[PDB]
Design a protein around this ligand. Structure first.
Ligand code: MG
Ligand code: MG
Ligand code: ZN
Lengths: 286, 110, 221, 166, 44, 294, 150, 154
């Protein structure tokens, strides 16, 4: 036995760290965690977003129906109305509608040649659970979300995010909310492909339909480049020629894959979603 | 000749866990149709062999009790008779070994 | 470890008896129901007189409610693994029977309803100062509905169901250490009638092995 | 010393909800202070890894090593306690998920040599550990095939990125 | 998976029968090849 | 009528409905006692569940050696499928291929092989022709080939199978063996069997014959995967028992006045009784000859 | 070393700055002591600097807890769920202010090796190079040693 | 280079090997069934057969009497050999002994086998027996044999 207390304390702390690593604890709410003040968190959230959110509207948006039901159940269990808390269904509907309209208008303005199906699919991708939940988690909406179950379900998180959007629409008008949408949902298209967002099947048929609309002749697929045709690692570049004029070229491992890629490239060119297209203008409205 | 350096645990594992040094799986194990115990195809069943050995030891003890001395080998044949059995015409003229038990089913009186 | 060394001034103190003084005979056809009677009543009256002499503040007419409460509380102790309260509620002869086979099993039990009110059927007491302690035992009959669902160590259902209530008729014998100032009525044991129907079959299938055989031995029928 | 392997038979899992699959039973058994070398016992422990409770017993019964009998006795008692104490319906429905050997407390003795020299011999002792899991033995992993190799090579080729560039 | 040999499952009656069959077949096959020039010979 | 796929779907739906009906009829859990009367492990008592437990479960209470070796179950002196649920307390014995008198085991194995041959023959035909499975004759084992009777389409009146066709049938049978599909058994009533096989006149005739034979007028049915057919008795537990399987004989039965019936013939040997290459070739050559019941 | 430590690529949280800049720091929690000699700098910072920092950063929630502790501490929590804990033990007010400003300026991503000093989701504009980029074409696409119209 | 060496090297020498084989043969003649290591119990099987051949030759033969006196350490077994053992196999021209491998010895894990004289009074040993003729393969082969016999007799 050696005299000392500092070494024993440090080793006890290291042992506690090892025990935590061996038996990870289940996650808990940040509100349940110490150093929490809901009003200050709401105000700081508004200031970080740099927009004049109304406190009452924002709190009603963060209040969900499932939390209200859970609170009523807890009141019934405790035998205790004073829990007349508004749900965020109306704000969620308003925010969802305004966001859909704003995204549709922005996509129509930026890419006029995009068809209605493409615009709808892009709007659905931007308003889907993945993008909306990612944005909410990175904006700490999930921390302020009042939900019965932790972690917050993706549908509840999306509803809370759209309720926040609707509260912003009510508080600061439509233009500020449109700027917020442009800054926080349009940016999610960065580093994304048109067909990576909108998943299509049989691009050749869609290309043929577009050429029929534009009165272009039926495209002809021709092998432009070939390498290692009779090997295990072939490369093919197939070009689509309309009236002996090249409109797109696609590479692939087989002839069918190369032709499909060429059709996809032609569709991207027709819809204006080229890789070297003009970047989205994020400059302030002046 | 002394070793030059200590051999590492990696080399030791590679030597020890080689498939040649591992125990091979025996595929000749079968089931004895009589006693139901496991046996090899080319080896007699241990259960039945032990049973036969016990019976043979009892018979030899009775034979020695009848003989009652060393260097006493009968000049005639030997027949073992169990309870409720009488000497037969074949058994006539042969030394009779009396066993105080019922004849086993496997010990068919041929 | 069976017995402490002899010639010791300190003797082992026992707060309960191994068995019943006289097992009450369960009437045949009692499930259907759900002179000698006078003699049994007189014996019960003698036992009640002894019990009241040792503790006047006692009522046989009110005992069955206390017995039912003790039964329910002891089974809830079985449910929630409250061994201290179970010890306070039952005797040392009864605790091992309840807790020995459920050490690594989950027991879920409830007391839904009582089909018939509990009735005292026999009261008897031990002889005067067997070891300086006089024990009184009361036999009660309960025709109630219970739910049982036992799970194994891995959380798999093993026997019974927690949802469907089933009729249970049972005789419970209670014992109290009258001489002990702090002694109280505790569940001593239960009596299974010979005519009682067998319990429900278990979920799993059990193989009963045949007689073991040595090499020199031969099987017999 | 450490005796944590016996405590693993005291883990009381919570009751399973009806919308859950049936949890296989797990039985831990061990034998301590066996007068045998752990290095020699390792081969016997390895031989019966992943096999069935009957094939393993057959191999141990028809193996000539001294520890085969001890491992067979351990497996027999483990099967008996799995059927009796634990809730295992069929005794043949078990497979050896784990089996291993470890060192134990040993004694040192003096070995005499010539010219007054001597050596130190150690009386080796080993422990045997076994874990049985209810259910048929898991199927052996199929050998890696040419199709799998080609797929992996193509994936490696397609995962290439231009390194040290913009 | 069990090791097998041709006469493992054969009975006492069938043990000599298969041997006789295979011996007769081998003898017939050997005898049938005694006329290479009478059975489609290659050019000499 | 319906397509063959829809007909199989309807038959499977009726089979599952009958299975559910029997399971519902099975009241809760009841304990039955099964006493083992075999030479090995005598005096064993199994406390099993009525209409649920099987002789396979009895062998699993016993050792895996019993499970693999045992092919048929003798219950109260009657043949019983290893997967057929037990209905009452009784006495049980296990029968393997290498028994002293494996007559019942041989019969069950040949019936299972005939059923598999019928299934593969039915499935290995284009939709342009009609395959009408009739019945499996109970030819003795010593004949050397199990046989099944099929009435093909009139377009195939002048058609005869080729060596490539026989090879394709053999490959389909081997694929069925590799699938390891157990021989599910179900004893249904005559009305249920008639409802199941209403589209097949030969099958309903055989069902009527079985109902006439049995005083209770119940008919046994067996299913491998999705193929459902009537059987004359118990079958082997799983298709994995068969090791060497080949169909190399199709004989046109004469006279052909009613229709051109074709008898498909095959020879099989289980894993436990496999044969050498030369012996198997001799058996195949023998089985290529026509086998006729006497 | 690099081989003994994890690594990542340069990135940002929700494309911070593309449309607007959002301060990634969300919460600062100071645990200080009233009588501890090692918390003199922390006490001075709380007295004369924390109010100005709170004014300059309205979007950061600042909690101060004066409890018995030998080692005063500061915990920074960022919008991306990252939590960083730093010690202000025996640090002057200027050092504490510099540390707080550094935590405020940090984006919350793990401070590890960055493989490339640049990041771009559109590396090429005119087209990424392929082996056929600079190669010419042949009439009828004839390969070398190939006869046309055999 | 041991090519064509029918006799193996056992014991302390040739004489020791002869004495060990003689003791094993004497025990076999006495008890008519002995278990021994496989090599040792296999080496003297031919010696036992030739001893039975000498017994058949008879006690009146001087060479046979000398051989019996040598190979039988206990002199009470010579009358047995010349009076009961030889007449028992008088009909047979050979194969008087059965040797069967048994499970290995417990201690040294040695390959063990039991040898016995045919027709002994001791209980019969379990024997390797072929499959019954009623099996599937045997029935198929019997049918093939019947068909081939019919074809031959046709
Ligand atoms: Mg000395
Ligand atoms: Mg030697
Ligand atoms: Zn045996």
């Amino acid at each position: 036995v050696k005299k000392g207390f500092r070494a024993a304390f440090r080793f006890q702390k290291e042992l506690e760290r090892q025990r935590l690593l061996r038996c990870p604890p289940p996650p808990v709410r940040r509100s349940e965690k110490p150093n929490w003040d809901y009003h200050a968190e709401i105000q700081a959230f508004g200031h970080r977003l740099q927009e004049n959110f109304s406190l009452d509207l924002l709190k009603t948006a963060f209040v969900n129906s499932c939390y209200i039901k859970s609170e009523e159940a807890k009141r019934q269990q405790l035998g205790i109305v004073l829990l007349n808390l508004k749900s965020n269904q109306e704000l969620s509907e308003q925010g969802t509608s305004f966001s859909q309209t704003c995204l549709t208008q922005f996509l129509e303005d930026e890419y006029p040649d995009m068809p209605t199906e493409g615009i709808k699919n892009l709007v659905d991708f931007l308003t889907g659970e993945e993008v909306v939940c990612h944005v909410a988690r990175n904006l700490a909406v999930e921390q302020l979300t009042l939900s019965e179950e932790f972690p917050v379900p993706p549908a509840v998180l999306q509803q809370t995010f759209f309720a926040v959007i609707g509260a912003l629409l009510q508080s600061s008008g439509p233009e500020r909310t449109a700027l917020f949408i442009r800054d926080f949902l349009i940016t999610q298209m960065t580093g994304k492909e048109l067909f990576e967002m909108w998943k299509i099947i049989n691009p050749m048929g869609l290309l043929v339909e577009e050429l029929k609309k534009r009165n272009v002749s039926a495209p002809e697929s021709r092998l432009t480049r070939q390498s290692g045709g009779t090997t295990a690692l072939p490369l093919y570049f197939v070009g689509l020629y309309c009236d002996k004029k090249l409109i797109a070229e696609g590479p692939g491992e087989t002839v069918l894959v190369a032709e499909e890629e060429a059709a996809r490239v032609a569709l991207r060119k027709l819809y204006g979603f080229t890789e070297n297209r003009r970047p989205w203008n994020y400059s302030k409205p002046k | 000749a002394a070793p030059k350096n200590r051999r590492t645990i990696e080399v030791n594992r590679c030597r020890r866990r080689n498939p040649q040094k591992l125990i091979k799986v025996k595929n000749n194990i079968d089931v004895c149709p009589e006693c139901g115990h496991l046996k090899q195809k080319h080896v007699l069943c241990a259960y039945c062999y032990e049973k036969v050995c016990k019976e043979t030891a009892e018979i030899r003890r009775q034979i020695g009790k009848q003989e009652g001395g060393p260097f006493k080998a009968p000049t005639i044949e030997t027949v073992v008779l169990y309870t409720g059995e009488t000497p037969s015409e074949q058994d006539q003229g042969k030394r009779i070994i009396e066993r105080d038990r019922k004849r086993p089913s496997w010990f068919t009186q041929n | 470890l069976v017995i402490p060394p002899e010639k010791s001034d300190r003797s082992i103190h026992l707060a309960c008896t191994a068995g019943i003084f006289d097992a009450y005979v369960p009437p045949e056809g009692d499930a259907r129901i759900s002179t000698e009677r006078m003699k049994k009543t007189m014996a019960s009256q003698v036992s009640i007189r002894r019990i009241k002499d040792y503790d006047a503040n006692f009522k046989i007419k009110d005992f069955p409610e206390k017995a039912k409460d003790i039964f329910i509380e002891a089974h809830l102790c079985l449910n929630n693994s409250d061994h201290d309260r179970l010890h306070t509620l039952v005797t040392e002869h009864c605790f091992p029977d309840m807790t020995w086979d459920i050490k690594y099993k989950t027991v879920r039990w409830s007391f839904v309803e009582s089909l018939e009110p509990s009735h005292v059927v026999q009261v008897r007491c031990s002889s005067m100062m067997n070891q300086g302690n006089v024990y009184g035992q009361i036999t009660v009959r309960m025709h109630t509905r219970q739910t049982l669902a036992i799970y194994d160590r891995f959380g798999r259902l093993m026997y019974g169901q927690e949802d469907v209530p089933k009729d249970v008729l049972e005789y419970v014998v209670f014992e109290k250490q009258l001489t002990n100032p702090y002694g109280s009525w505790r569940m001593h044991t239960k009596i299974v009638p010979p005519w009682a129907p067998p319990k429900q079959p278990i979920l799993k299938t059990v193989m009963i092995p045949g007689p073991q055989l040595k090499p020199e031995e031969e099987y017999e029928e | 010393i450490s005796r944590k392997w016996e405590k693993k038979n005291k883990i009381v899992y919570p009751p399973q909800l009806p919308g859950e699959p049936r949890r296989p039973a797990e039985i831990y058994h061990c034998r301590r202070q066996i007068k045998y070398s752990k290095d020699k016992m390792w081969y016997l422990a390895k031989l019966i890894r992943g096999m069935s409770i009957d094939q393993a017993l057959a191999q141990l019964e028809f193996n000539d090593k001294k520890g085969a009998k001890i491992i067979k006795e351990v497996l027999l008692e483990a099967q008996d306690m799995a059927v009796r104490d634990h809730n295992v319906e069929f005794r043949s429905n078990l497979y050896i998920a784990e089996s291993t050997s470890g060192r134990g407390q040993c004694l040192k003795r003096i070995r005499y040599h010539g010219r007054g020299r001597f050596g130190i011999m150690e009386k080796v002792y080993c422990h045997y550990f076994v874990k049985l899991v209810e259910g048929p033995p898991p199927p052996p992993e199929p050998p890696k095939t040419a199709v799998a190799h080609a797929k992996e090579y193509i994936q490696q080729l397609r995962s290439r990125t231009i390194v040290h560039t913009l | 998976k069990s090791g097998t040999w041709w006469d493992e499952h054969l009975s006492e009656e069938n043990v000599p029968f298969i041997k006789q069959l295979v011996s007769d077949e081998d003898k017939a096959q050997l005898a049938s090849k005694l006329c290479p020039l009478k059975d489609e010979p290659w050019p000499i | 009528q319906l397509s063959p796929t829809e007909l199989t779907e309807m038959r499977n739906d009726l089979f599952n409905k009958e299975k559910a009906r029997q399971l519902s009829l099975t009241p809760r859990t009841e304990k039955i006692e099964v006493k083992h009367v075999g030479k090995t492990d005598p005096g064993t008592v199994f406390v099993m569940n009525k209409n649920i437990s099987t002789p396979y479960s009895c062998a699993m209470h016993l050792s895996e050696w019993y499970c693999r070796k045992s092919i048929l179950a003798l219950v109260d002196g009657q043949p019983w499928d290893m997967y057929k649920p037990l209905t009452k307390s009784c006495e049980i014995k296990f029968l393997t291929f290498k028994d002293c008198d494996p007559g019942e085991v041989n019969k069950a194995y040949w019936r299972s092989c005939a059923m598999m041959m019928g299934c593969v023959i039915e499935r290995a035909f284009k939709d342009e022709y009609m395959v009408n499975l009739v019945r499996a004759p109970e030819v003795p084992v010593i004949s050397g080939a199990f046989c099944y009777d099929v009435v093909l389409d009139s377009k195939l009146d002048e058609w005869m199978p080729t060596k490539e066709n026989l090879r394709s049938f053999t490959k389909d049978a081997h694929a069925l063996i590799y699938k390891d599909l157990p021989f599910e058994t179900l004893e249904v009533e005559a009305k249920v069997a008639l409802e199941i096989f209403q589209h097949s006149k030969y099958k309903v005739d055989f069902i009527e014959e079985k109902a006439s034979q049995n005083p209770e007028r119940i008919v046994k049915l067996h299913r491998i995967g999705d193929f459902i057919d009537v059987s004359e008795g118990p079958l082997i537990p799983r298709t994995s028992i068969c090791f060497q399987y080949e169909v190399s004989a199709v004989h046109n039965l004469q006279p052909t006045q009613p229709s051109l019936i074709r008898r498909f013939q095959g020879v099989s040997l289980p894993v436990h009784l496999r044969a050498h290459f030369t012996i198997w070739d001799k058996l195949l050559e023998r089985s290529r000859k026509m086998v006729t019941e006497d | 070393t690099a081989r003994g430590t994890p690594s990542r690529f340069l990135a940002s949280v929700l494309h911070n700055g593309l449309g607007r800049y959002v301060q990634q720091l969300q919460r600062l929690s100071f645990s200080v002591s009233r009588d501890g000699a090692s918390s003199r700098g922390a006490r001075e910072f709380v007295e004369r600097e924390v109010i100005d920092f709170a004014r300059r950063n309205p979007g950061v929630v600042i909690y101060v807890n004066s409890r018995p502790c030998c080692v005063p501490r500061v915990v920074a929590e960022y919008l991306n769920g990252a939590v960083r804990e730093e010690s202000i033990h025996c640090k002057s007010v200027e050092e504490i202010s510099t540390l707080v400003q550094k935590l405020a300026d940090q984006s919350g991503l793990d401070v590890i090796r960055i493989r490339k000093p640049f990041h771009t989701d559109n590396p090429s504009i005119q087209g990424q190079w392929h082996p056929f980029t600079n190669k010419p074409t042949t009439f009828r696409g004839l390969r070398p040693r190939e006869v046309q119209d055999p | 280079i041991s090519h064509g060496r029918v006799f193996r090297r056992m014991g302390l020498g040739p004489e020791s090997r002869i004495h060990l084989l003689r003791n094993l043969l004497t025990g076999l003649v006495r008890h008519e069934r002995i278990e021994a290591p496989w090599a040792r119990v296999d080496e003297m099987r031919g010696y036992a057969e030739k001893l039975i051949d000498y017994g058949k030759l008879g006690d009146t033969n001087e060479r046979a009497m000398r051989m019996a006196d040598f190979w039988l350490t206990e002199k009470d077994l010579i009358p047995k050999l010349f009076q009961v053992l030889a007449p028992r196999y008088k009909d047979q021209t050979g194969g008087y002994t059965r040797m069967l491998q048994i499970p290995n010895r417990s201690l040294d894990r040695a390959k063990m086998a039991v040898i016995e004289y045919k027709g002994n009074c001791l209980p019969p040993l379990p024997l390797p027996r072929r499959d019954s003729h009623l099996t599937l393969l045997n029935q198929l082969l019997q049918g093939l044999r019947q068909d081939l016999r019919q074809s031959q007799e046709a």
